[PDB]
Ligand binder design. Structure first.
Ligand SMILES: CCCCCCCCCCCCCCCC(=O)O
Ligand SMILES: CCCCCCCCCCCCCCCC(=O)O
Lengths: 129, 129
């Protein structure tokens, strides 16, 4: 129903391979790979505000599902894409050659980002306030 | 008693003035000045692990109070300093020309950094888990 909340990263798979493939500087990969930070989502209907801790960067994006949005990626590049709702608990988007699926299951969020043969997967858990 | 917790930034003063004074690019200042993120402290006796959300950057430092440690600053520079514990609720250190005081009262942390005539103050509140 609602994605809103604060989520702490629990585990992730293939961070280094994915970050190398998108061209992140090696120095930012090494300092960011072991950080387990907190991301915050604010949902108002179809409108989303994301404050994402990804490695050693904080990225803030907003968008409305189904509307074209301009989004900052991990490299700082801005991309124009549309985020779709699949079901009621999955956000799905494509940009460049990446497919991103954000799936909510109770207190667990799983983000899966596929780039060619690399699947970068983040599992986070809702902070219970 | 214990600093351990996740702390969400509530308010801050002189973020822009401090970041300009230490040489951060205006681009990074504008990106980060409105972010109200979560920082995490883990205390075990004299040992502290910090995961700090500072603007658009996440910085992860670790130190034992009273021992010289290398700490990453906002500029990416690693400084060697000693942090001391004053009482049970104040962390005090000085590096370059900055004095930093981190004070815990109840569930509120007040961080005050003084650089010349600029007092950079951050007020953050413990997330009640
Ligand atoms: C679509 C690009 C957004 C920014 C790219 C950063 C790479 C990681 C994105 C994961 C954010 C998904 C939100 C769930 C919480 C989390 O995993 O932090
Ligand atoms: C002294 C090394 C750290 C350098 C980073 C400076 C940016 C502000 C640091 C304040 C963190 C203090 C912990 C309380 C929580 C917070 O304010 O995020």
């Amino acid at each position: 129903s609602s994605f809103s909340g604060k989520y702490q990263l629990q585990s992730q798979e293939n961070f280094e391979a994915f970050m190398k493939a998108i061209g992140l500087p090696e120095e930012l990969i090494q300092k960011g790979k072991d950080i387990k930070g907190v991301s915050e989502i604010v949902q108002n209907g179809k409108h989303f505000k994301f404050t994402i801790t990804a490695g050693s960067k904080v990225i803030q994006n907003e968008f409305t599902v189904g509307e074209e949005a301009e989004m900052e990626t991990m490299t700082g590049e801005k991309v124009k894409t549309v985020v779709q709702l699949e079901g009621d608990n999955k956000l799905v988007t494509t940009f460049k050659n990446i497919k991103s699926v954000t799936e909510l299951n109770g207190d667990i969020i799983t983000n899966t980002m596929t780039l060619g043969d690399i699947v970068f997967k983040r599992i986070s858990k809702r902070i219970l306030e």
